[PDB]
C-alpha cells in the first residue's frame, strides 16, 4: 500500500498510478512573480453558516472532518468556479519540524502544514462521479504558521488523542469550519490533481495568500497521531506531504494585484 516513507513514498506511486507523471498534476510551487493577476476573477462566495459536521477519523495518512454534505449546507462558489460546490470534509498535512509540512510552496517557501477544504461539483450527482471530471472538485488551500494560536482549531486538536491509529473514528458534530479562515479570501487558482493516490486530475485549486497561525503546541498534538493501526508498532503521523511537481505549461492566476 502507498504512503510517505522511503520505500512507499510519493516517488513510488507513479508504479501503481501511472497518471503520477501527468499534465496537471498537484502540488506546485506558487511563483509569485510569475503569477498573473486575472481582473476577470470573482470574489469567493464561502457559505458554511449552515455546516453540520459528522466525524473525525484517522484514515492512516492523516485525519479528516466529515461533513454532511446530502444538501446545499456549507457550499463555495465564485472565483473561478461555475456551479456550486459542496463542502465534503476538511484534512491537514504537516512536517516533523515546523520548516515543513505543506503541500503547495510559495516562492519555494514551505509552511508549517496545509488545509484542504474539499468539495464538489453539484452538478455531478454525488463524490465519486465528481472525481471522475475535469471540473469536479475545488479544495481551498490554506497555509498554517507558528506563532499565536488558532482557537477555532482547539476543538480538533483536543479530540485528536481518541483517533490516534488508524481506522480509529469518533463523532464529531457542530464545529464551525468558518473559525479556520483567514480575515483574506485573495487567492491564486490553477487546474491540478488530487495529492493522494489516485491522484485524479480533477480538482480546481483555490489556494489563499493569507496564512493562518497555528501555536507550536496545537501543531505538536498532530505529531502524535500514528499511521499504524492499533496493537501495531508505532510510527508517527508526520510529513504526510507530497513535493511540487512540475507546472509543465499551466498558468496559475491571482485575484489580487
Ligand atoms: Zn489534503
Given at each position: 500500500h502507498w504512503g510517505y516513507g522511503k520505500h512507499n513514498g510519493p516517488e513510488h506511486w507513479h508504479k501503481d498510478?501511472?497518471?503520477?507523471?501527468?499534465?496537471r498534476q498537484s502540488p506546485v510551487d506558487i511563483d509569485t512573480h510569475t503569477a498573473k493577476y486575472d481582473p476577470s476573477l470573482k470574489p469567493l462566495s464561502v457559505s458554511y453558516d449552515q455546516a453540520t459536521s459528522l466525524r473525525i477519523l484517522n484514515n492512516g495518512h492523516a485525519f479528516n472532518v466529515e461533513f454532511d454534505d446530502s444538501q446545499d449546507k456549507a457550499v463555495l462558489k465564485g472565483g473561478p468556479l461555475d456551479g456550486t460546490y459542496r463542502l465534503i470534509q476538511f484534512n491537514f498535512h504537516w512536517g516533523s519540524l515546523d520548516g515543513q509540512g505543506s503541500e503547495h510552496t510559495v516562492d519555494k517557501k514551505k509552511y508549517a502544514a496545509e488545509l484542504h477544504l474539499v468539495h464538489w461539483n453539484?452538478?455531478?450527482?454525488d463524490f465519486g462521479k465528481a472525481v471522475?471530471?475535469?471540473?469536479?472538485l475545488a479544495v481551498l488551500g490554506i497555509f498554517l504558521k507558528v506563532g499565536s494560536a488558532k482557537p477555532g482549531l482547539q476543538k480538533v486538536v483536543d479530540v485528536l488523542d481518541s483517533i490516534k491509529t488508524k481506522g480509529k473514528s469518533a463523532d464529531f458534530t457542530?464545529?464551525?469550519?468558518?473559525?479556520?479562515?483567514?480575515?483574506s479570501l485573495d487567492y491564486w487558482t490553477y487546474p491540478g490533481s488530487l495529492?493522494?493516490?489516485?491522484?485524479?486530475?480533477?480538482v480546481t485549486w483555490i489556494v489563499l495568500k493569507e496564512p493562518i497561525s497555528v501555536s507550536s503546541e496545537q501543531v505538536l498534538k498532530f505529531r502524535k497521531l500514528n499511521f499504524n493501526g492499533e496493537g501495531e508498532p508505532e510510527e508517527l503521523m508526520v510529513d504526510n506531504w507530497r513535493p511540487a511537481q512540475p507546472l509543465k505549461n499551466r498558468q496559475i492566476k491571482a485575484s489580487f494585484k
Open positions: 498510478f501511472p497518471i503520477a507523471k501527468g499534465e453539484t452538478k455531478y450527482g471522475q471530471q475535469p471540473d469536479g457542530n464545529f464551525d469550519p468558518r473559525g479556520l479562515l483567514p480575515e495529492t493522494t493516490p489516485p491522484l485524479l486530475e480533477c
